[PDB]
Design an enzyme around this catalytic site. Structure first.
Site, PDB file in Angstrom:
ATOM      1  N   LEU A   1      40.272  36.830  33.909  1.00 52.14           N
ATOM      2  CA  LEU A   1      41.715  36.687  34.434  1.00 52.14           C
ATOM      3  C   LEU A   1      41.549  36.784  36.040  1.00 52.14           C
ATOM      4  O   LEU A   1      42.169  37.109  36.583  1.00 52.14           O
ATOM      5  CB  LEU A   1      42.586  37.763  34.169  1.00 52.14           C
ATOM      6  CG  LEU A   1      43.062  37.782  32.538  1.00 52.14           C
ATOM      7  CD1 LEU A   1      43.906  38.888  32.515  1.00 52.14           C
ATOM      8  CD2 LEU A   1      44.018  36.465  32.196  1.00 52.14           C
TER       9      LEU A   1
ATOM     10  N   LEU B   1      38.347  36.639  39.616  1.00 53.37           N
ATOM     11  CA  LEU B   1      37.341  37.504  39.652  1.00 53.37           C
ATOM     12  C   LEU B   1      37.768  38.512  40.878  1.00 53.37           C
ATOM     13  O   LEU B   1      38.343  38.074  41.758  1.00 53.37           O
ATOM     14  CB  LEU B   1      36.104  36.615  40.484  1.00 53.37           C
ATOM     15  CG  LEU B   1      35.320  35.929  39.471  1.00 53.37           C
ATOM     16  CD1 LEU B   1      35.733  34.945  38.580  1.00 53.37           C
ATOM     17  CD2 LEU B   1      34.142  35.025  40.302  1.00 53.37           C
TER      18      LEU B   1
ATOM     19  N   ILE C   1      37.366  41.641  43.823  1.00 55.95           N
ATOM     20  CA  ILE C   1      36.446  42.068  44.679  1.00 55.95           C
ATOM     21  C   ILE C   1      35.241  42.756  44.361  1.00 55.95           C
ATOM     22  O   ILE C   1      34.216  42.236  44.521  1.00 55.95           O
ATOM     23  CB  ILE C   1      37.195  43.079  45.856  1.00 55.95           C
ATOM     24  CG1 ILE C   1      38.521  42.533  46.342  1.00 55.95           C
ATOM     25  CG2 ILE C   1      36.437  43.242  47.116  1.00 55.95           C
ATOM     26  CD1 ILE C   1      39.808  43.529  46.394  1.00 55.95           C
TER      27      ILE C   1
ATOM     28  N   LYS D   1      34.704  41.773  37.797  1.00 52.89           N
ATOM     29  CA  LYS D   1      35.624  40.698  37.073  1.00 52.89           C
ATOM     30  C   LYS D   1      36.618  41.372  36.394  1.00 52.89           C
ATOM     31  O   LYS D   1      36.585  42.526  35.495  1.00 52.89           O
ATOM     32  CB  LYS D   1      34.490  39.999  36.099  1.00 52.89           C
ATOM     33  CG  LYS D   1      33.600  41.061  35.237  1.00 52.89           C
ATOM     34  CD  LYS D   1      33.007  40.348  34.040  1.00 52.89           C
ATOM     35  CE  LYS D   1      32.485  41.495  33.167  1.00 52.89           C
ATOM     36  NZ  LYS D   1      31.604  40.602  32.089  1.00 52.89           N
ATOM     37  N   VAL D   2      37.858  40.701  36.465  1.00 53.74           N
ATOM     38  CA  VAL D   2      38.938  41.415  35.782  1.00 53.74           C
ATOM     39  C   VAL D   2      38.924  40.691  34.356  1.00 53.74           C
ATOM     40  O   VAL D   2      39.338  39.461  34.312  1.00 53.74           O
ATOM     41  CB  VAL D   2      40.237  40.855  36.635  1.00 53.74           C
ATOM     42  CG1 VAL D   2      41.471  41.808  36.268  1.00 53.74           C
ATOM     43  CG2 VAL D   2      39.852  41.160  38.024  1.00 53.74           C
TER      44      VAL D   2
ATOM     45  N   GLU E   1      48.697  46.484  34.058  1.00 53.83           N
ATOM     46  CA  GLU E   1      49.814  45.498  33.785  1.00 53.83           C
ATOM     47  C   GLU E   1      49.279  44.086  34.349  1.00 53.83           C
ATOM     48  O   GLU E   1      48.845  43.790  35.297  1.00 53.83           O
ATOM     49  CB  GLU E   1      50.971  45.948  34.725  1.00 53.83           C
ATOM     50  CG  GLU E   1      52.035  44.868  35.012  1.00 53.83           C
ATOM     51  CD  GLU E   1      53.387  45.377  35.689  1.00 53.83           C
ATOM     52  OE1 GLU E   1      53.152  46.074  36.403  1.00 53.83           O
ATOM     53  OE2 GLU E   1      54.355  45.011  34.943  1.00 53.83           O
TER      54      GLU E   1
ATOM     55  N   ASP F   1      46.665  46.791  53.269  1.00 51.21           N
ATOM     56  CA  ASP F   1      46.095  45.644  53.038  1.00 51.21           C
ATOM     57  C   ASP F   1      47.236  44.787  52.488  1.00 51.21           C
ATOM     58  O   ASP F   1      46.955  43.896  51.677  1.00 51.21           O
ATOM     59  CB  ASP F   1      44.884  45.497  52.085  1.00 51.21           C
ATOM     60  CG  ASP F   1      44.188  44.166  52.212  1.00 51.21           C
ATOM     61  OD1 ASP F   1      44.250  43.643  53.457  1.00 51.21           O
ATOM     62  OD2 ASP F   1      43.217  44.015  51.095  1.00 51.21           O
TER      63      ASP F   1
END
Ligand SMILES: CCCc1c(C(=O)Nc2cc(S(=O)(=O)N(C)C)ccc2C)cnn1-c1ccccc1
Lengths: 339, 335
Positions: A20, A22, A24, A27-28, A89, A136
């Site tokens: 879903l 990449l 920081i 990997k998500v 979420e 941020d």
């Protein structure tokens, strides 16, 4: 009230290979809690004090609807590393400004522009209410839930967030001397205020479709409000912005003021006047990247980096140059005794 | 020389196995930086992945420019290239340029918000900045966008001048000399503004809009006299200036209260309006502020590097194969 879990996350969720996007810091992944079949994004950080604060903060913040929900936090070993796995979420709705570019176009309005802000405004207001600065706030941490029209906007990534101090800022007097007095150091004044600066810029972009920066050559703001795009906008709106972009952190607008301002406080009934932003954002994808990149660059100069080192006193400092020269002081000292 | 892949800063990085422990660091603005460890040299290094280096011709050109700058920058107080590499095995795969550099501790932008730098600090830092500029200047090169967030410093007060991209958008420009709103001295004005900030805590000229920036500048250094008025380009510039209540420069001794007289003296020479009267880096180093550090037998110049095909206009692939040449042809410095 965050209970970081100790067992293997795979006991409770199925971790898929579906990527879903990449992160920081890694990997998500998409995953699925086995009991409910619910879907979630799984981001992951390296375990260490920063990360454990970062997540505590985010957990607290999760109570705000315009902030992305931390659902669950495991502590496992991945790839030989102590890791905090973080179940969140899922947000299928893209970045805020990409939505605007993806339009019929139904023209983007001013009333639309006010809600977006009120949303981002609530998310800060919550954060600041519990003495936390996200530092941020920028267009890539502002995701919608979905492609659907009821989609809600949400603030994300707490990687720069930090607890901060609830201190009144003094309101500087009208009459001041010609001389520059010494600064009383108070790094924390750059915390909350950073968030307020970002609201100012995102608002500026939202309205016209370009940023309030300069260019280098000579569609760039320069903290003016160019005709044509700005010809239709209220003077009370521009003053919001000027007050948001005030270059003095102690003088800049505070989120309470922001959220009391009528353009916000009474957004439901803001003038419907249409806006160029979408057709402008469409003009140059390559340029919009530079927007994003300079905003990230600008923010670095507007938050403190509490991670960076302190400079030793000179007589405690040593380095090549510092001895090259000291080594010459003594060469002269010696030369004069020696003859 | 084989590589490993690793998901960092939102892209798939592949770097040599010599570089271990890639942790992200810093803004992550114009390409993303990672703190690493280089087992070949044995020390700690910043590794930077260039962002979108061959998207436009505009980009492709700048990348090539940037690279040749960096390859020719061999000075203690300037950012220098330890390594440059690419996972690509041939021009056909050429996609990403990586750059390696020493790794520092903090930037002066951040130091100023956190610390009360002593006079000695100020002496040593401005020394190192000027030492650096002389080199840079002797190479026929103007930094342009010199600022505190380009002055990397580590804990033993070492300083290195970063960021030659200009040599797009810029948020503020408090450190930019009024001419470029130009000689090399443009850079001395920035060093002027910076020294001011180190001495004070505060941005010298924290202008909002552009009009504002100009007034704030002129409010210190006086409005120009007719002589230097005539040298301004745009008619509407000449007017604006003449529409102001006219005034002389002021004693910097009255502004910078409790500073080191010698510092004020030097600051006076750095923040002069008439660019043709502003002190050079070479000259600056001789100033008595820097007695403790001025050694002319170790304030080295550079040798110049030509225009080559930097005033040639070319297609993307043309800049792309030129850049490749520079990557493969890079040779490291002695261990
Ligand atoms: C962007 C600064 C990061 C940083 C560096 C760095 O930026 N190194 C660097 C420079 C260039 S550059 O200056 O040529 N440039 C921008 C085009 C090109 C490539 C790298 C790898 C060094 N220390 N820190 C650093 C600074 C503060 C704290 C910790 C570390």
């Amino acid at each position: 009230g965050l209970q970081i879990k100790k067992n293997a996350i795979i006991d409770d969720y199925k971790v898929t290979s579906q990527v879903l996007g990449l992160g920081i810091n890694g990997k998500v992944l998409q995953i699925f809690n086995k009991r409910t079949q619910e879907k979630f994004a799984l981001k992951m950080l390296q375990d260490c004090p920063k990360a454990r604060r970062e997540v505590e903060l985010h957990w607290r913040a999760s109570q705000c609807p315009h902030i992305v929900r931390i659902v669950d936090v495991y502590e496992n070993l991945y790839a030989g590393r102590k890791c905090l796995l973080i179940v969140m979420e899922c947000l299928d709705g893209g970045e805020l400004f990409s939505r605007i570019q993806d339009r019929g176009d139904q023209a983007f309005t001013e009333r639309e522009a006010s809600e977006i802000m009120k949303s981002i405004g609530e998310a800060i207001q919550y954060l600041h209410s519990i003495n936390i600065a996200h530092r941020d706030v920028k267009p890539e941490n502002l995701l919608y839930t979905s492609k659907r029209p009821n989609a809600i906007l949400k603030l994300t990534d707490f990687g720069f967030a930090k607890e901060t101090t609830s201190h009144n800022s003094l309101t500087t007097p009208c009459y001041t001397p010609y001389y520059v007095a010494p600064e009383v150091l108070g790094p924390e004044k750059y915390d909350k205020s950073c968030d307020m600066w970002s609201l100012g810029v995102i608002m500026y972009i939202l309205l016209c479709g370009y940023p309030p920066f300069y260019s280098n050559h000579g569609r760039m703001g320069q903290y003016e409000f160019p005709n044509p795009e700005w010809s239709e906008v209220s003077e009370e709106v521009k003053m919001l912005i000027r007050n948001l972009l005030k270059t003095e952190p102690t003088q800049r607008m505070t989120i309470t003021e922001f959220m009391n301002h009528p353009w916000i406080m009474q957004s439901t009934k803001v003038p419907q006047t249409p806006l160029h932003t979408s057709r402008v954002l469409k003009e140059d994808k390559e340029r919009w990247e530079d927007v994003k990149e300079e905003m990230t660059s600008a923010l670095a100069t507007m938050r403190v980096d509490y991670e960076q080192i302190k400079i030793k006193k000179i007589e405690d400092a040593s380095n090549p140059l510092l001895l090259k020269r000291r080594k010459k002081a003594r060469a002269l000292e010696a030369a004069a005794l020696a003859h | 020389p084989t590589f490993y892949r690793q998901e960092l800063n939102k892209t798939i990085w592949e770097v040599p196995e010599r570089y271990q422990n890639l942790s992200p660091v810093g803004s992550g603005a114009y390409g993303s930086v990672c703190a690493a460890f280089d087992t070949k040299t044995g020390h700690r290094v910043a590794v930077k992945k260039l962002s979108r280096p061959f998207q436009s011709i505009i980009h492709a050109k700048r990348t090539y420019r940037e690279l040749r700058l960096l390859k020719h920058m061999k000075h203690e107080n300037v950012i220098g290239l330890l390594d440059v590499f690419t996972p690509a095995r041939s021009l056909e795969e050429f996609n990403d340029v990586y750059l390696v550099t020493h790794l520092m501790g903090a930037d002066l932008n951040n130091i100023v918000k956190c610390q009360k730098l002593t006079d000695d600090h100020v002496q040593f830092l401005i020394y190192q900045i000027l030492r650096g500029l002389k080199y840079i200047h002797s190479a026929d090169i103007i930094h342009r966008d010199l600022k505190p967030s380009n002055l990397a410093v580590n804990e033993d007060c070492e300083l290195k001048i970063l960021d030659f991209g200009l040599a797009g958008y810029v948020a503020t420009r408090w450190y930019r000399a009024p001419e470029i709103m130009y000689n090399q001295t443009v850079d001395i004005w920035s060093v002027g503004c910076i020294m001011a900030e180190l001495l004070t805590g505060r941005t010298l000229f924290p202008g909002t809009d552009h009009i504002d920036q100009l007034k704030l500048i002129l409010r210190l250094v006086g409005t120009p006299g007719a002589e230097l008025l005539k040298k301004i380009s745009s008619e509407s510039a000449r007017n604006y200036i003449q529409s102001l209540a006219q005034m002389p420069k002021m004693n910097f001794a009255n502004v910078f209260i409790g500073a080191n007289p010698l510092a004020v003296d030097l600051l006076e020479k750095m923040l002069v309006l008439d660019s043709d009267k502003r002190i050079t880096a070479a000259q600056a180093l001789a100033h008595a502020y820097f007695a403790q550090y001025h050694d002319p037998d170790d304030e080295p110049v550079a040798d110049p590097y030509d225009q080559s095909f930097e005033s040639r206009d070319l297609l993307i692939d043309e800049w792309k194969s030129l850049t490749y040449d520079e990557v493969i042809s890079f040779v490291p410095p002695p261990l």
